[PDB]
C-alpha cells in the first residue's frame, strides 16, 4: 500500500514474469534477462540489440557462475541500477 511496498511487490512480480518463461522458473536465462531489460528497463538502459551485450550482462550478474540470474543476483542488478540513478542527482 505505501510506494515502497509497491516497489517490493513490483520487484518480485517482474522477476517471476520473466524467470518463469522457460527452464528453471526461479532463474532468468539469457533470453529472459534480455527481454526483462528491453521491455522493463528501457528508460534506464539502452535496448540490447547485440548478442554480446546479453552475454556480457549475464557474465556480470551471474555471481555463483551457473549460467543464469537467480533472484539474489537480480536484486544485486537492481541495487546497481538504483545506485547509478543518483548520480544523476
Amino acid at each position: 500500500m505505501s510506494e515502497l511496498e509497491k516497489a517490493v511487490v513490483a520487484l518480485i512480480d517482474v522477476f517471476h514474469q520473466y524467470s518463469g518463461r522457460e527452464g528453471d522458473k526461479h532463474k532468468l536465462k539469457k533470453s529472459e534477462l534480455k527481454e526483462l531489460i528491453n521491455n522493463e528497463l528501457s528508460h534506464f538502459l539502452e535496448e540490447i540489440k547485440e548478442q554480446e551485450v546479453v552475454d556480457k550482462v549475464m557474465e556480470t550478474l551471474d555471481s555463483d557462475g551457473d549460467g543464469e540470474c537467480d533472484f539474489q543476483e537480480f536484486m544485486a542488478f537492481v541495487a546497481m541500477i538504483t545506485t547509478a540513478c543518483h548520480e544523476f542527482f
Binding site: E46, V53, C85, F88
Partner: peptide, 9 residues
C-alpha cells in the same frame, strides 16, 4: 535516464 552500460558492465 540512460544509466548505462559500462557503468554497470
Amino acid at each position: 535516464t540512460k544509466i548505462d552500460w559500462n557503468k554497470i558492465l
